[PDB]
From Swiss-Prot:
Ca(2+) 1 binds at E10, D66, E68, D102. GO terms for cellular component: adherens junction; apical plasma membrane; apicolateral plasma membrane; basolateral plasma membrane; catenin complex; cell surface; cell-cell junction; cortical actin cytoskeleton. The chain holds residues 161 to 374 of 906 of the full protein. The keyword Transferase does not apply. Three calcium ions are usually bound at the interface of each cadherin domain and rigidify the connections, imparting a strong curvature to the full-length ectodomain. Calcium-binding sites are occupied sequentially in the order of site 3, then site 2 and site 1. It comes from Mus musculus (Mouse). Disruption phenotype: Embryonic lethality. The gene is Cdh2. This is Cadherin-2. The lineage of its organism: Eukaryota, Metazoa, Chordata, Craniata, Vertebrata. Changing R13E: Loss of dimerization. Expressed in cardiac muscle (at protein level). Keywords: Calcium, Cell adhesion, Cell junction, Cell membrane, Cleavage on pair of basic residues, Glycoprotein, Membrane, Metal-binding, Phosphoprotein, Repeat, Signal, Transmembrane, Transmembrane helix.
Amino acid sequence: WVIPPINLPENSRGPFPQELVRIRSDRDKNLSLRYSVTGPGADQPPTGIFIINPISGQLSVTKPLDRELIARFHLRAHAVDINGNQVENPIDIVINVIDMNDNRPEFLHQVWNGSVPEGSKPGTYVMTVTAIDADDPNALNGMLRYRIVSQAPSTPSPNMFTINNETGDIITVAAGLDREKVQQYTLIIQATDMEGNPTYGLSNTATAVITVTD
Ligand SMILES: [Ca+2]
Ligand SMILES: [Ca+2]
Ligand SMILES: [Ca+2]
């Protein structure tokens, strides 16, 4: 066998120590054994998180894990005798730090600039804003989707532009961009994670100051 990569959530609350798996050998059913665990998260930075029980072999976490820092741990528990000789070859222990949505979708610029050619056909791409998620790019924890919360001004009338829910590329979908009637628009663009869930997913805003060229 080996040890089926134990998946352990991010930011947990133990109370650490939190036992995971009691790494037992067969030699311990012969010679009395001494266990140790080496790999980052163990001995190597972060110095002290996963620790085995030298006596009982019970692997254990000592503080909550957090992916933005390390998302996965590869460890090796060692078996030694009274002479320092390894009695068994160091077992691999893959500790997957299962993710938890723990941060909003962040934009790359609190303000964004752009412009469209005044009288321009619908479909045109003004600018492209983006916001991402520090997540596990695969989970609706980091999947974003955008949408325009507001438009200023609103004349001729609003609903003039539109962001592609997934990409970012804003597009003018309403004729009449009059550099005279309104020479500068200030769009408020929002991005939410969890593919959009209005409560589950968290969100952010930014501004798309779209300008009307000659
Ligand atoms: Ca985290
Ligand atoms: Ca997370
Ligand atoms: Ca997120």
